[PDB]
Amino acid sequence: ATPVTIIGLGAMGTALANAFLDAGHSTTVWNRTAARATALAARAHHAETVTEAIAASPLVIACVLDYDAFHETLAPATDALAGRALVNLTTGTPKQARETASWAADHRIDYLDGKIMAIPPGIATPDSFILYSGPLGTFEAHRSTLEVLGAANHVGTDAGLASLHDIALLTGMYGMIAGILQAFALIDSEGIPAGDLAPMLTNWLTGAAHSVAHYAQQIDTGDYETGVVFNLAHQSHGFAKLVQAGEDQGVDVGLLRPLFELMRHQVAAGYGNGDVASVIELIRREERR
Amino acid sequence: ATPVTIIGLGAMGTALANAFLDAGHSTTVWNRTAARATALAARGAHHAETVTEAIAASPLVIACVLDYDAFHETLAPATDALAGRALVNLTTGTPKQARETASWAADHRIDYLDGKIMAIPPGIATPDSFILYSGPLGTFEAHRSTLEVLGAANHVGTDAGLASLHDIALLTGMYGMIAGILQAFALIDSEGIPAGDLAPMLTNWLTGAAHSVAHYAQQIDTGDYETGVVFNLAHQSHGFAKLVQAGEDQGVDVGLLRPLFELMRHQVAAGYGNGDVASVIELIRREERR
Ligand SMILES: NC(=O)c1ccc[n+]([C@@H]2O[C@H](COP(=O)([O-])OP(=O)(O)OC[C@H]3O[C@@H](n4cnc5c(N)ncnc54)[C@H](OP(=O)(O)O)[C@@H]3O)[C@@H](O)[C@H]2O)c1
Ligand SMILES: NC(=O)c1ccc[n+]([C@@H]2O[C@H](COP(=O)([O-])OP(=O)(O)OC[C@H]3O[C@@H](n4cnc5c(N)ncnc54)[C@H](OP(=O)(O)O)[C@@H]3O)[C@@H](O)[C@H]2O)c1
């Protein structure tokens, strides 16, 4: 029954507000532009300033463009934030997440840094989950409430950890996106619709997604050799056909050159009998090699 | 059961020979290094000393060597030996290689078929295995049921280069995913988190991601990058920027993602910022298709 307050009513903010009203939470809303709050008020208290939105709820959820937008909005109202739960679901770096979290510990604000792994329509469906990092007490207080938005997964007390997980998950997805676009550009070079390849490509990538754990185990033991089916020397040999075909077809293949480069270096450095995961030794933190 | 000849008995070629043996075909084998032929002879394969004897044994010949150069170096002397036969080439190569091979074949009365294995040797003749074929439909039709010993058989068109094109497209999707996986682990590793600690979440995330493929295919084929946009490209470009800043904050190389990032920024600068990331295809697709 927890009253909640939403700061920022963009596409993501609007979905959060709407999901709470559905679950029956006394919802207060606020936005830098009053228009966006209008439909919400029809179905929610539209507070006229940041402090009114803040003061109405023990839980304050902020969700604006970037962190610079996060300061200017809420930095004047620290004292109104004192003794409240402030959940900041704004995209940014781990460094930003930890700076903001110590700032929030100075002014007695129970800070939680969160990152939505969902698209606005997906809120309040089993497809949404949000990662939170920061004090386990703050999080555990509002969990059932936050479970309105979707799954709530606390990933650590280090405040930047949700941000790190978020960036890691998006780098995963973006890598796949570049693969997909490159695959489509290749098949497009002979006039085939993307739609003709989509079902096969979806199945292929779904199976490929099961090697994640394979790579993890290789990275965690440092053994890139045990259980390799098609080794790196062979992958690098064949990968070169992917690049030469691409330019035979008039298709740019620069999206794949960086990984290819790393693979070829690890082959030349002696890792050709192991798996492609050994590439990680060229891009991980130096201290961890 | 049609007799079959396997030319090339490395890991994959040995798997094909074993599948045909297990299915009861009379299987003749040949490898540049005799040792690998001797291993299959132990199982009942007919070990042929030369490529011509092996080819002469069978109406259907399946080559599976390292690359199209080995294929050419091996089968060109035996060109005449191959007249009147079906030749199925499962070697990885480019569409240009498949098409030039299919021209050489059709010039010398060789029934040619170019195929590509989407499987690893353990997967052959299991339900996970499929092979794409392209080239003359007649060859594919006469020998399809034999080829199904190896796994599913999908003829993807008469342009002999099309199996190779399909194979490369799929490997390209997979390797971009691999680049993303390794980048994600390198980032999570920067705080000493075990890769295995992220792997379940990463796997579930990317299996969900994989079902976005149809969406991007819809945007590419309709040429409409703007309808169906939740989070536009100009915002993604913003987010991507922080994603790269975090990597250097954490001491992790983020070079795997810079080429995509550059295409994204170029598209925002050209005025596509209200569309989706799929519009990046305009910058890499063949000029005639833009
Ligand atoms: N949308 C998604 O798919 C999605 C998914 C996961 C995470 N996120 C994250 O959630 C956050 C919200 O993004 P969104 O897509 O909802 O972005 P959006 O549609 O741009 O909304 C951003 C919010 O930022 C406010 N804003 C922008 N500049 C501001 C400033 N300079 N000072 C104060 N407020 C400002 C806006 O209010 P005005 O409109 O009044 O300017 C707006 O309500 C982002 O960090 C995004 O990365 C979004
Ligand atoms: N997971 C897989 O293994 C897999 C999956 C899909 C596709 N493929 C494709 O299948 C093909 C074969 O791969 P593989 O894993 O079986 O590779 P492999 O185990 O390295 O065996 C390569 C084969 O090529 C032969 N070869 C190499 N150079 C040659 C030459 N110059 N003249 C004649 N024969 C030559 C080898 O003979 P020697 O024994 O005398 O070296 C051997 O028979 C590759 O193009 C690969 O891309 C493999």
DSSP character string of B221-232: HHT--STT-SS-
What's the maximum distance between 2 C-alpha atoms anywhere in chain A? 66
Name the DSSP letter for residue B253. -
**How many residues are given for chain A?**
289
Residue of A nearest to B211 (CA): A202
Amino acid at B161: G
Residue of A nearest to B277 (CA): A177
Instruction: Check A205 against B203: CB less than 8 A apart.
Output: no
Nearest CA-CA partner of B224 in B279, B284, B283, B288 = B279
Rounded Cα distance between B113 and B82, Å, is: 13
Experimental method: X-ray
Ligand 2 atom closest to Cα of B13?
16
Alpha helix locations (H) across chain B?
A: 11-22, 34-41, 51-56, 68-75, 95-107, 137-147, 162-189, 195-210, 213-222, 233-249, 258-269, 281-284
φ, ψ of residue A165 in degrees (nearest 5): -60, -40
Which residues neighbour A36 within 8 Å (Cβ) at sequence distance 6 or greater?
A: A9, A10, A13, A14
Strands A85-88 and A59-62 come out as: parallel
Q: Are A194 and A188 in contact (CB under 8 A)?
A: yes
Q: Are B198 and B184 in contact (CB under 8 A)?
A: yes
Of A32, A46, A49, A64, the residue with max ligand 1 atoms within 8 A of its CB, to mutate for a pocket test, comes to A64
Rounded Cα distance between B218 and A182, Å, is: 15
- Touching check for B127 and chain A: CB below 8 Å? no
A253 C-alpha to ligand 1 centroid (Å): 33
- Touching check for B64 and chain A: CB below 8 Å? no
Rounded Cα distance between B24 and B1, Å, is: 7
**From the CA of A35, how many Å to the nearest CA of chain B?**
19
Nearest CA-CA partner of A4 in A120, A87, A121 = A87
Residue of A nearest to B163 (CA): A187
A102 C-alpha to ligand 1 centroid (Å): 23
Ligand 2 within 6 A of A240 CB?
A: no
**From the CA of A133, how many Å to the nearest CA of chain B?**
14
Residue B40, classed as helix, strand or coil, is: helix
Of B230, B231, B245, the residue with max ligand 1 atoms within 8 A of its CB, to mutate for a pocket test, comes to B231
Amino acid at A69: A
φ, ψ of residue A53 in degrees (nearest 5): -55, -45
SS3 labels along chain A: CCCEEEECCCHHHHHHHHHHHHHCCCEEEECCCHHHHHHHHHCCEECCCHHHHHHCCCEEEECCCCHHHHHHHHHHHHHHHCCCEEEECCCCCHHHHHHHHHHHHHCCCEEEEEEEECCHHHCCCCCCEEEEECCHHHHHHHHHHHCCCCEEEEEECCCCHHHHHHHHHHHHHHHHHHHHHHHHHHHHCCCCCHHHHHHHHHHHHHHHHHHHHHHHHHHHHCCCCCCCCCCHHHHHHHHHHHHHHHHHCCCCCCCCHHHHHHHHHHHHHHHCCCCHHHHHHHCCCHHHC
Ligand 1 atom closest to Cα of A13?
16
**From the CA of B22, how many Å to the nearest CA of chain A?**
21
- Touching check for A258 and chain B: CB below 8 Å? yes
A287 C-alpha to ligand 2 centroid (Å): 38
SS3 labels along A71-112: HHHHHHHHHHHCCCEEEECCCCCHHHHHHHHHHHHHCCCEEE
CA dihedral B43, B49, B55, B60 (to 10 degrees): 10
Token pair in block for residue B267:
């598209």
Q: Are B186 and B252 in contact (CB under 8 A)?
A: yes
- Touching check for B260 and chain A: CB below 8 Å? yes
Q: Where are the domains of chain A?
A: 1-156, 157-289
Intra-chain end-to-end CA distance of chain A, in Å: 49
Nearest CA-CA partner of A79 in A113, A111, A109 = A109
Q: Are A171 and B257 in contact (CB under 8 A)?
A: yes
Chain breaks in chain A (C to N over 2.5 A) after: 43
Contacts of B186 in chain A (CB under 8 A): 280, 283-285
Residue of B nearest to A233 (CA): B66
How many CB atoms sit inside 10 A of residue A176's CB?
A: 27
Residue B241, classed as helix, strand or coil, is: helix
**DSSP letters spanning B44-109:** T-EE-SSHHHHHHT-SEEEE--SSHHHHHHHHSTTTGGGTTSEEEE-----HHHHHHHHHHHHHTT
Rounded Cα distance between A225 and B67, Å, is: 24
Instruction: Check B174 against A204: CB less than 8 A apart.
Output: yes
Which residues neighbour A39 within 8 Å (Cβ) at sequence distance 6 or greater?
A: none
